[PDB]
Amino acid sequence: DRTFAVKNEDGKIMGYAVAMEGKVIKPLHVKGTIDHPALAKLKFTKSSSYDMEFAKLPTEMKSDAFGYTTEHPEGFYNWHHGAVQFSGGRFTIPTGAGGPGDSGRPILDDSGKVVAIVLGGANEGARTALSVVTWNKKGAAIKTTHEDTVEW
């Protein structure tokens, strides 16, 4: 696979790292050790601004990793827990469909490319708006945070 559990000392899942475009990327707030022998002890570079940390993907894994795409037209997208809507510049899910432990999971299109990484969500009632990292065409990271975001 290309998505890895990040585990605390008791071995409980805290969040997820992904393999993407020659990097291991996980949310910075996710406390733990990636649960992969090749990934556990790499040198990570940490960016507070984007709540992101990343390491170089070990050479073994370069044909494995997800592709990223900047093409997110309005519509529906996929994640581990089901449909993610993208509309008016925001990703949303039914409230209750995501929660703590979900930080780091990718949002995917039907071809299996990453459009966004999940940081948290703000409860707006029926729907929860997702705080995420995306990248633009020049490779610049963008963090979108909504009011009263709960880190997952």
Numbering used by the authors: 116 to 267
From the study:
Similarly, the structure of AVCP complexed with dioxane was refined to 1.98 Å resolution with Rcryst value of 17.9% and Rfree value of 26.7%. The superposition of AVCP-apo and AVCP-dioxane structures showed RMSD of 0.133 Å and dioxane binding does not affect the overall structure of AVCP. The electron density for the dioxane molecule is clearly visible in the difference Fourier map in the hydrophobic pocket of AVCP. Dioxane binds to the hydrophobic pocket in the AVCP-dioxane complex in almost the same orientation as that of the SCP-dioxane structure with similar hydrophobic interactions. However, in AVCP, seven residues (Met135, Glu136, Lys138, Ile140, Tyr183, Trp250 and Gly254) are in hydrophobic contact with the bound dioxane molecule. Eight residues out of nine in this hydrophobic pocket are strictly conserved whereas Met137 of SCP is substituted with Ile140 in AVCP. Further interaction analysis of cdE2 and capsid reveals that dioxane occupies the same position as would be occupied by the pyrrolidine ring of Pro405 of cdE2. Thus, competitive inhibition could be a plausible mechanism by which dioxane and its derivatives may disrupt capsid-E2 interaction in alphaviruses including Aura virus by obstructing the hydrophobic interaction of conserved Pro405 with CP. The crystal structure of the AVCP-dioxane complex has also been determined and the most striking feature observed in it is that dioxane exclusively occupies the position of Pro405 in the CP hydrophobic pocket. The conservation of alphavirus capsid hydrophobic pocket and binding of dioxane to the same hydrophobic pocket in the crystal structure of CP from two alphaviruses (SCP and AVCP) signifies that a broad-spectrum inhibitor that targets CP-E2 interactions during virus budding can be developed.
The nucleocapsid core is formed by the encapsidation of RNA by CP which consists of two domains: the amino-terminal domain that is involved in RNA binding and the carboxyl-terminal domain that possesses protease activity. The E2 glycoprotein interacts with the nucleocapsid complex via a hydrophobic pocket present in the carboxyl-terminal region of the CP that leads to budding of alphaviruses. Alphavirus CP possesses cis-autoproteolytic activity for its cleavage from the rest of the structural polyprotein during the viral infection process. Here, we report the high-resolution crystal structures of the post-cleavage state of the AVCP and dioxane-bound AVCP at 1.81 Å and 1.98 Å resolution respectively.
